[PDB]
Structure 1
């Protein structure tokens, strides 16, 4: 565990993270995909061996000794708001179990279902709150990766609000 478990946010490519493992915003089929998933595929392609897993779950595959936790958020184009919200919360709960199982002291996480799976909506607060619900009971340092300057400021504010 981290000596003083923290949350941080950085505005940069999660494929360049400084943590002991990474969460991929995966698709259910283990395909290279788009956005975060395509960056993770370019950096750790070996971790897509048998990475297919259902919505609301996480599946870890090692790239060398570096764990890639493939977390499948719901596509809100397909899910109802209610069922989508349930599956998004479940995906993060499965990430917390994997981060714990791995015994890592840090993890790089993206906001699940906030990009092409957002169904055209701003889901920063929804996704981040599910992330906190799952990760608060873990003792890994969590480093959230985003690309938008306004999202960086809002995520940082939400972290600071609790401190």
Structure 2
């Protein structure tokens, strides 16, 4: 049961993976960031229902199954309680990957944009991603958007191995 990771610099709303993770809000409504991009292309895969922080929910559409996952908002929560919720959030994703036997999945770095509190959280968010998704079988496309985050991302993924 071993997962794979690769990095992709681009708009996650254009991922070829059948299953895309959304960085969602508690309210389940769009959405700047990746959420706004996914709602722009795949409104079907949104239910617009609340989601508990640190939880996730699978919404299925004709084109894409989106796992809407709620990372902490570091504007609102402490660093410690945020690290819990971020782990929590990713773990919830892995749960859904494992329950549905999803084999290939595209995931953004939760809590690194709108919910970052204006701090670089690449490493932090990546670690929690790799830790939960390591419990999956999935080929994971980690999605970023800055060329520098790409290099840093690629380099960390590679270390592991």
Matched, 1:71 2:69: yes
Do the aligned partners of 2:3 and 2:134 also contact (CA within 8 Å) in 1? Answer: no
State the Cα deviation string for residues 49-99 of structure 1 (Å, max 9, x = none). Answer: 244201000011101263110000010000000111110000000000001
TM-score, length basis structure 1: 0.95
Residue 153 of structure 2 corresponds to which residue in structure 1? Answer: 155
Give the SS at the match of 1:103: coil
CA distance in 1, matches of 2:11, 2:50: 23
State the Cα deviation string for residues 86-141 of structure 1 (Å, max 9, x = none). Answer: 10000000000001112121000000000010001000001000001100121110
CA distance in 2, matches of 1:50, 1:31: 5
CA distance in 1, matches of 2:63, 2:105: 14
Residue 138 of structure 1 corresponds to which residue in structure 2? Answer: 136
Give the SS at the match of 1:128: helix
Residue 62 of structure 1 corresponds to which residue in structure 2? Answer: 60
TM-score, length basis structure 2: 0.96
CA distance in 2, matches of 1:84, 1:34: 20
Do the aligned partners of 1:146 and 1:152 also contact (CA within 8 Å) in 2? Answer: yes
Counterparts of 1:2-151 in structure 2, within 5 Å, are 5-64=3-62, 66-151=64-149
- The 4+ residue runs of structure 1 with deviation greater than 4 A are none
CA distance in 1, matches of 2:49, 2:106: 18
User: What is the RMSD of the two structures over their aligned residues, measured on CA atoms?
Assistant: 1.3
CA distance in 2, matches of 1:35, 1:12: 13
Distance 1:51 1:99, change over 3 A: farther
Do the aligned partners of 2:7 and 2:141 also contact (CA within 8 Å) in 1? Answer: yes
Aligned residues: 161
Give the SS at the match of 2:7: strand
